[PDB]
Amino acid sequence: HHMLVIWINGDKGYNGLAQVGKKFEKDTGIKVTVEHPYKLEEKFPQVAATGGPDIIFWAHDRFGGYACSGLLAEITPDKAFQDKLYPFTWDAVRYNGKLIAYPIAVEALSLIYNKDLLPNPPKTWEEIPALDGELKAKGKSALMFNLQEPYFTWPLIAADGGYAFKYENGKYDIKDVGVDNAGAKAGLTFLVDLIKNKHMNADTDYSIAEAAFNKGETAMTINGPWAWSNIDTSKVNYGVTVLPTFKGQPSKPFVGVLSAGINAASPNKELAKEFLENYLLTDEGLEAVNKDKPLGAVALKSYEEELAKDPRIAATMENAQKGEIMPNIPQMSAFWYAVRTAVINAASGRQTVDEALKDAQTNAGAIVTPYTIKGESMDPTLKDGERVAVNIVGYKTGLEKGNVVVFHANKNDDYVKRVIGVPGDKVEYKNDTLYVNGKKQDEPYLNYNLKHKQGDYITGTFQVKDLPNANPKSNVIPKGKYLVLGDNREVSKDSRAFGLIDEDQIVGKVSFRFWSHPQFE
């Protein structure tokens, strides 16, 4: 209740932001604490309810997910205040008609280069192999940048046609994903070729690339405005310019708007608003942050009119113009995770580009929704109160035996049971022995219950032909129908009672974490 806690990423001007906090404290007596936890954008949903920060700073893309999860307060700037920021910046922080954060600054990646090593930066990605050859001859490299985060590789991937979700007629279509089209494949292939030919290393990360550029070991890097301070300190004579083209096409970075959201569970929402509107988003407040680590093109018109005079900001905005504003939809998290996996696997050689991007295409558009389990009839596989992630099954798409499915039982109730037979399968039980298509099928998920039973058998003999919604002449499950049973077979009310369910009732599949995995792969 007494103070404000603020989370901002470790690459941003958090010391500058703390100075703004000190000013607010001096004026108001209210203490401001600035933290930069590792992967804060992932930690925030974990803690948000269980009081998390009062204010969270991140690029706008993560906020729709947070808003959809109920974690953010609607902000309430008046007309006068809204008019002080560029209208397009407010667009980035509007979700389902409501403003869900304060925009701070526009961030786009640029090509950063060492003028002493490379007085004329390359116009094309295609030049970089030969350039690297020349620089290797003097113990340097052409290009190093963070290959572990897809943000940095995306500009090249999107150059010849890759995209995240198609925006059309006022809406993003999350069924239309552009991760495995021809342009995406060509870009990712080029990146993999660079690595194969030792022009880049698949292990290069943020710190490795930053250290290399700032020590004069590589001629070029790709980074955002927040990086410029450290380069100033290093004394490298650097330029900031337009990203090179690929196959004749501009690189297309995803453009972020650094934004500040207010935790829905904060008891300090009024103080948060005062801090953001009257201290941070002023010429003085932004200057303090900007002098620590540059923000980019700020949302506040009065200060941006000064910052826009800087050629480096002109480069930033030129690259932004070829790129695109990130979507803010909840599905963005899944997209980024899918593309991060594809880039890592393709770059390490675990998968071919075609395989990696095929999986990413699938994973980027797969909807995942949380559920809570109620009752004992799946015990011990699922427990009463257990939180699970449910993979939504597309309208009429790939259910298989063994899938644990959530389904609508009626207008008011969803149930969860295991798929034991799919359409076309012939199924019966003899005591506790499952026969599918004439062959005994082991059920390892029943092991504990089979070995801790009250009665003679936990499932017991039955045939599909005797159940509701079955074909009474056959044990072959009809088209569109599913046989579902609860793992806690002795107590479960399932298809043995209510019969086969319909494909139209199925919501999705419960995802499970397997307890074992390799120690390195």
Partner: peptide
């Protein structure tokens, strides 16, 4: 997203 409660599924 909507901001509502997490749905429940009866086991």
């Amino acid at each position: 997203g909507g901001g509502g409660a997490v749905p429940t599924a009866k086991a």
